[PDB]
């Protein structure tokens, strides 16, 4: 009992009193010579998982990720919070977020496995020698998972902004989002998780009514290059070859996208 610890993740939900959270979900923890090896391997593995996560979280201190206890990290989101804790079986029926806590848990482990695949590949192919790794670069565990959520939030606000500044102003308009040596056995295994590790991006195309002289076209693309922040790309062209304009823009701040959307709709889209 000295140190035999596994990790579970619990999810907290914020409520309408708005002051504090409460617990809406929790991941389960399941209970010869090879069997003692098995338990010892699953033990070291999870201790590694918490170690690396703790290291990655150093980068995320600005993004709502707090490292509180040496065995616990808390990830704060507007309507939810996540706790990832490495704990023994002495301390501490189903519910809403149990399923999600279990998924985040399996995903966490899987992310470490991919890290293992990468180090090994890094060793197989290039070095004739030893690995080289960066926390910022190849250690991604929290970022890919958390990023999926933060992006969804970001995409929500963006659509709100678009409704206000554009959809409500110009009557016919609407919006449509669109999807943007032989080690090969290894690359195929890692490629399979590109789904989880790809930097998130969606393109929001704004449909505008066709003026009979010219057809204006506007679209925005949202992306999270470092997984936790947002970039907004706006392209506008309403060509009349006498009046023809083209804008290609990039913004890190929703405040400026409102100002630029306003500018655009004002001059070019409005009657």
């Amino acid at each position: 009992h000295s140190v035999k610890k596994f990790l579970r993740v619990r999810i907290f939900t914020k409520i309408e009193s708005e002051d504090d959270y409460i617990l809406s979900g929790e991941s389960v923890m399941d209970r010869d010579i090879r069997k003692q090896i098995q338990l010892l391997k699953k033990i070291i593995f999870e201790k590694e998982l918490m170690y690396q996560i703790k290291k990655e979280c150093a980068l995320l201190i600005s993004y709502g990720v707090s490292i509180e206890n040496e065995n616990k990290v808390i990830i704060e989101l507007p309507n939810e919070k996540f706790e990832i804790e490495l704990l023994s079986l002495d301390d501490d029926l189903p519910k809403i977020n149990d399923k999600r806590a279990n998924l985040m848990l399996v995903m966490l482990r899987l992310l470490l496995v991919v890290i293992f695949k990468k180090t090994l590949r890094s060793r197989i192919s290039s070095p004739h020698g030893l690995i080289n790794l960066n926390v910022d670069d190849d250690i991604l565990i929290i970022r890919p998972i958390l990023g999926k959520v933060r992006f969804a939030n970001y995409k929500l606000l963006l659509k709100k902004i678009i409704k206000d500044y554009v959809l409500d102003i110009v009557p016919g308009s609407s919006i449509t989002e669109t999807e943007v040596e032989n080690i090969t056995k290894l690359n195929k295994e890692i490629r399979a998780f590109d789904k989880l590790l790809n930097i998130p991006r969606r393109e929001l195309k704004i449909n505008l009514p066709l003026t009979e002289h010219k057809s204006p076209n506007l679209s925005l693309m949202l992306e999270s290059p470092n997984y936790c922040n947002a970039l907004i790309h706006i392209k506008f062209s309403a060509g009349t070859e006498a009046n023809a304009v083209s804008f290609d823009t990039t913004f890190s701040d929703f405040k400026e996208v409102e100002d630029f959307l306003h500018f655009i709709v004002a001059e070019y889209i409005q009657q």
């Binding site: 399923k99 999600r100 998924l103 985040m104 399996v106 995903m107 998972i145 999926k148 959520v149 969804a152 195929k188 490629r191 399979a192 998780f193 789904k195 989880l196």
Partner: peptide, 22 residues
């Protein structure tokens, strides 16, 4: 293998964000 994984993660990520919300 690969497709199985890509389909499985597609579900996992969807269910985990709960983005559907409609």
């Amino acid at each position: 293998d690969e497709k199985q994984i890509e389909e499985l993660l597609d579900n996992c990520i969807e269910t985990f964000v709960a983005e559907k919300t409609t």
